[PDB]
Amino acid sequence: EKRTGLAEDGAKSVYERLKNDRAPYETRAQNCAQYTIPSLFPKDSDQTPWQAVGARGLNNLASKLMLALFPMQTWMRLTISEYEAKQLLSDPDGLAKVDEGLSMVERIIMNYIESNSYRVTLFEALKQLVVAGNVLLYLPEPEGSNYNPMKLYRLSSYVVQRDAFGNVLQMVTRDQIAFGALPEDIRKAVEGQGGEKKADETIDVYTHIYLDEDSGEYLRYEEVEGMEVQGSDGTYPKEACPYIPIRMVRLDGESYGRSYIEEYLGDLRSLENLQEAIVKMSMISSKVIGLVNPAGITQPRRLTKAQTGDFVTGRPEDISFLQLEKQADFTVAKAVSDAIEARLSFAFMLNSAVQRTGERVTAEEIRYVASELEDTLGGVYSILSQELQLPLVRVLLKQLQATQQIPELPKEAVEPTISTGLEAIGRGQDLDKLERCVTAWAALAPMRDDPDINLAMIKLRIANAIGIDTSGILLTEEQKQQKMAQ
Amino acid sequence: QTPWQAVGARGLNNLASKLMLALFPMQTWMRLTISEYEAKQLLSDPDGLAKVDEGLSMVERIIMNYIESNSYRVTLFEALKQLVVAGNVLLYLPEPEGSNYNPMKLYRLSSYVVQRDAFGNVLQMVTRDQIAFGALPEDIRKAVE
Amino acid sequence: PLVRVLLKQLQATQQIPELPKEAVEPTISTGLEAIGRGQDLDKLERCVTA
Amino acid sequence: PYIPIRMVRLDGESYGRSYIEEYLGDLRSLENLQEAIVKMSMISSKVIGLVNPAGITQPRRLTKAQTGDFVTGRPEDISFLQLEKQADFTVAKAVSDAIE
Amino acid sequence: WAALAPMRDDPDINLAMIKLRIANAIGIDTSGILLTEEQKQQKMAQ
Amino acid sequence: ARLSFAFMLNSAVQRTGERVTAEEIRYVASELEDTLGGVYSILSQELQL
Amino acid sequence: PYIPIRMVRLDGESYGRSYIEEYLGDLRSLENLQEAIVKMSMISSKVIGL
């Protein structure tokens, strides 16, 4: 069947069209990668760098973020939905069974992420997210309990179109598979479409995903050499598309995202250009060249051949050694280079932005400057929890629930709330409030045996101000007199 | 074109980061409490009161759950940057509409306009989107040709 | 303004289960009050130390 | 549902002022200077030989020499072009730094 | 839990609930952390 | 020096510039731990499992 | 039982990148410089009478 809508005139033809507005982004990504790690986004179409600062910064930033966002620890938290949680009012037996299945679900997701090598690709994705605007993550249908890894498309080989509100209208990926590696059906279709193909010839395979105007849901198909692939068609519901295009830095009303490094590219290239001319300098400067005056007696052969300790026919007025003596010029260059590199280290939260060789670095300023690095990391992290973490989890839930790898739970826990960050680590806001109230209560120990002060009321008021539940914090009359008797 | 120095870049970035962690943290950040007038009514009625405070600090957690689930933090960040560099930002939050992914919309100063009265209340606004024809809704698309 | 609006939008779509009149127009604290490190707590535990 | 926000108010006016605007002077000053400084560092780090063509020392023979090599020439013919704007720099640096 | 030693002999504070709540926020199993009624009164007797 | 950070050589701490404090040693050492945790958490997925 | 391992993945590619590659520029630089310096030290240690 000929399909229409956004897929009216072929997948490849859409890819081609949308590529036009994507181009700036991939130029920008190519420039940033040039001065860090070029293999992330090479300057092929529309060699290593001199300095390694870009390289170790990017590597650092990714590592840090990946150990924050996706640690070996449990990192999401599923909890009962607010509405259904109001239902199980005065039903602890029926509740605590919900939370048991939810925290089971937690563990299943975790076991999946562990066993399908999600961490490794997430790393590569973070690098990409940092250097270029965007990554496209694709997680296929679980399909058994097999090794189901994730797939990553770097900005160069995929394309996106968003509406007014930033919702995804259509996507087109473009794999480049060698003919030999293609499935037989596809392989046969291709050569049956004319011209016999060599095993090492590469074949563009376009994958089109798009919103249908009629259905409130996505359609997908694969498309090779202008013809749709046999049984490559499919559909995805709007709220759970397994293709996730991620932006690092949003500009609303725009299909792709800006990148992190781009903001600090000015100072990065500046460093690169300088570090080059300095290294070259040092090379001229470490080269010894003698100068025998040919008007003199001292003959150069006789010098080169000499053993150490040797007396040789000559005068010292004939030989001189070519001195560079660009000694001051160097320290000006160095001072600048150093300044910039220092500025970059802060932007890559390298811990050795503390390392200043100027003065005796106190201990007290270290804590303050290290908390400027924590400040700016909290920034990217709290943005990448929304952008990368929550969508990845939300989609994994729906995917696993579809294949009944998630044993049936009671209605309450089908749409739970997904906590991430410090809550899940078990170091959250609730615990803090509780153990700040305990420390506030211990400060009325020097009046425990009160004359007429009434500890009960003050005890409850402290908890209220701080904001603990205080649902069964105070001992009731019947339970207190019961405990007074025993 | 990029700038020669990155002091401004890290400066703005710092400022926004700090502000956004202060204004919109993962913690609860608003607090809803009984109105002064109606609170005077429930004088000597604790049982009837702390039920109000119970439904309110429910409301808190609902708003919070929405802000978490609808990516409010990420757009607030971009808005704070905008707010610092250009004088003003425009936030648009559409009708919840089911229980779906309803994000917020941001209009930079360049693509919206405002007129205020004497007392500074809003009289009119006019935003200006710039959509590719292909992305438009079919009804509009067909009107346009 | 952000909060005030959300309240009115959520109460419109009855994504906010009905509460008794008192809590339809409440007062919206922000800042330190909410964090649980406010003026009230300070005054209390300054009175305990006195 | 449309909320137009201002950063810094000026009463009786539809739009708001910005935070950075207040400090723009010192910011553009910085940007002008750090430019002129960066460019300085590129001049200063560039080696350029000067072989006196009245002389004996021929430049082809200097560029082709290995390290350790002895070569026909006199050190009155080669000189390396020095920028020595060492003091002028630290003036510019002092000011840049003060602003930063 | 060692931080509520300066109020172990509580007047009307209820250690039981706060002890379980701390464990929940941290996120231990709490599957048989509290002493049950029959097992507690058994231990009080012995 | 730069390469020593990249190879997590402990003696990237060793700077002859200044009297190296005790408090910065810890902080710079944990840059090396940071970047080691990086390669390790990858190679655990790539090589170990 | 054949396990081919990659260090640094590039999705859609059969072989992996290396860890050192990312820092090779600074490494060859050192090698070149250290060579010219060691060679300097042999010229500097050599006594020749005239």
Author numbering:
A (entry chain B): 3 to 48, 55 to 494
B (entry chain A): 55 to 199
C (entry chain A): 399 to 448
D (entry chain A): 250 to 349
E (entry chain C): 449 to 494
F (entry chain C): 350 to 398
G (entry chain C): 250 to 299
Task: Quote what the paper states about this structure.
Phage portal proteins are key viral components located in a single pentameric vertex of the capsid and they act as initiators of capsid assembly. They are also critical components of the DNA-packaging complex and are involved in tail assembly. Here we report a number of crystal and high-resolution cryo-electron microscopy (cryo-EM) structures of the T7 bacteriophage portal (gp8). The structures show two conformations—open and closed—of the portal and suggest a possible mechanism of the channel valve that regulates DNA passage.
Several X-ray data sets from various crystal forms of the T7 portal in its dodecameric (12mer) and tridecameric (13mer) forms were collected. Although the portal protein is always found as a dodecamer in virions, assemblies containing 11–13 subunits have been described for other portals when expressed under non-physiological conditions. The T7 portal structure was finally solved by combining cryo-EM and X-ray crystallography. An initial map of the tridecameric form of the gp8 protein at 5.8 Å resolution was obtained by cryo-EM (gp8-13merEM). The ring-shaped volume allowed the ab-initio building of a partial poly-alanine model composed mainly of α-helices, which contained 36% of the structure. This partial model was later used for phasing a 3.4 Å resolution gp8-13mer crystallographic data set by molecular replacement and a full atomic model was built into the resulting electron density map (gp8-13mercryst). A deep cleft separates the wing and crown domains, which are connected only by a hinge at G434 between strand β13 of the wing and helix α11 of the crown. This feature confers some freedom of movement to the crown domain around that point, which is also supported by the fact that monomers from the dodecameric and tridecameric structures are very similar, except for the relative position of the crown domain respect to the rest of the protein (root mean squared deviation (RMSD) 0.849 Å).
